[PDB]
Amino acid sequence: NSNICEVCNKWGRLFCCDTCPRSFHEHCHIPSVEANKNPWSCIFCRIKTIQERCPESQSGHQESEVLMRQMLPEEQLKCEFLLLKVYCDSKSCFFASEPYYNREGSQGPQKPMWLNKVKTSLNEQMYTRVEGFVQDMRLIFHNHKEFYREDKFTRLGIQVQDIFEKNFRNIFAIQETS
Ligand SMILES: [Zn+2]
Ligand SMILES: [Zn+2]
Ligand SMILES: [Zn+2]
């Protein structure tokens, strides 16, 4: 197994996957690493199993269909993994905890949003469809773009949104287009 957490790339108290060489901190894994379960399989392994059980699940899909899916166990898992993939980028630090807004010439968003709030919402099964989760994730970056206006710091939102969108298209097998 790896000697650093797959998400934050730090050592510490790590839990090891039994089916692949990744390791995690307890709360870096999503969902949080389970109390017992020997053997234990990480989310990367669980996602791979879905695809192997139903190879046709990798054929292309329309985003509009994906968004209307109900949050059954498999879609819940895919959203958890997509959230995890965003936390894997170090620039997610800017969007993790609850923001505050006091900048000359700007007004804070009507509906603040951040990664830890989405994480909690997923944990508490607050989303009924994929659309709920995707809307909140996109709202994080849209709020950032609007607030920071022409400051170059706006680019961090563009950057992290691109990681989200690429991973969304991969995990949910969105039909490739020009
Ligand atoms: Zn970690
Ligand atoms: Zn694994
Ligand atoms: Zn199948």
Query: Residues with Cβ < 8 Å from 8, sequence gap 6 or more?
Result: 25, 28, 87
What is the token pair recorded at 101? 């807004």
Proximal ligand: closest to the CA of 58: 3
Same domain, 110 and 136: yes
What is the token pair recorded at 160? 């992290």
Expressed in angstroms and rounded, the spacing between residue 52 Cα and the centre of ligand 3 is: 8
Same domain, 49 and 91: no
Q: How many angstroms separate the CA atoms of 36 and 34, rounded? A: 6
Same domain, 27 and 104: no
Expressed in angstroms and rounded, the spacing between residue 55 Cα and the centre of ligand 3 is: 6
Same domain, 126 and 156: yes
Q: Of 38, 59, 80, which residue sits at a domain end? A: 59
Determine contact, residues 71/79, Cβ cutoff 8 Å. yes
Expressed in angstroms and rounded, the spacing between residue 7 Cα and the centre of ligand 1 is: 5
Question: Nearest Cα to 148, choosing from 95, 115, 99, 106?
Answer: 106
Report the CATH number at residue 29. Answer: 3.30.40.10
Expressed in angstroms and rounded, the spacing between residue 65 Cα and the centre of ligand 3 is: 18
List, as one string, the DSSP characters of 41-75: --HHHHHHHHHHH-GGGGS-B-HHHHHT-B--HHH
Neighbours of 119 (CB within 10 A): 19
Question: Nearest Cα to 42, choosing from 25, 20, 60?
Answer: 20
Identify the experimental approach. X-ray
Determine contact, residues 38/15, Cβ cutoff 8 Å. no
Query: Residues with Cβ < 8 Å from 85, sequence gap 6 or more?
Result: 163, 164, 167, 171
Domain count, the chain: 2
Q: How many angstroms separate the CA atoms of 109 and 87, rounded? A: 22
Proximal ligand: closest to the CA of 21: 2
Same domain, 6 and 34: yes
Sign, CA dihedral 126-67-40-21, equals negative
Expressed in angstroms and rounded, the spacing between residue 33 Cα and the centre of ligand 1 is: 11
Expressed in angstroms and rounded, the spacing between residue 58 Cα and the centre of ligand 1 is: 29
Expressed in angstroms and rounded, the spacing between residue 47 Cα and the centre of ligand 3 is: 14
Tell me which amino acid residue 98 is. E
Q: Which domain holds residue 168?
A: 60-178
Report resolution (Å) to 1 decimal.
1.8
In this structure, which residues have their CB less than 5 angstroms from ion ligand 1? Answer: 5, 7-8, 25, 28
Same domain, 76 and 135: yes
Tell me which amino acid residue 87 is. Y
Question: Nearest Cα to 155, choosing from 144, 139, 164?
Answer: 144
List for the chain the helix, strand, coil content (%; round to 5). 50, 5, 45
Determine contact, residues 60/174, Cβ cutoff 8 Å. yes
In this structure, which residues have their CB less than 5 angstroms from ion ligand 3? Answer: 54
Report the CATH number at residue 117. Answer: 1.20.920.10
Query: Residues with Cβ < 8 Å from 7, sequence gap 6 or more?
Result: 24, 25, 28, 29, 84, 87, 88
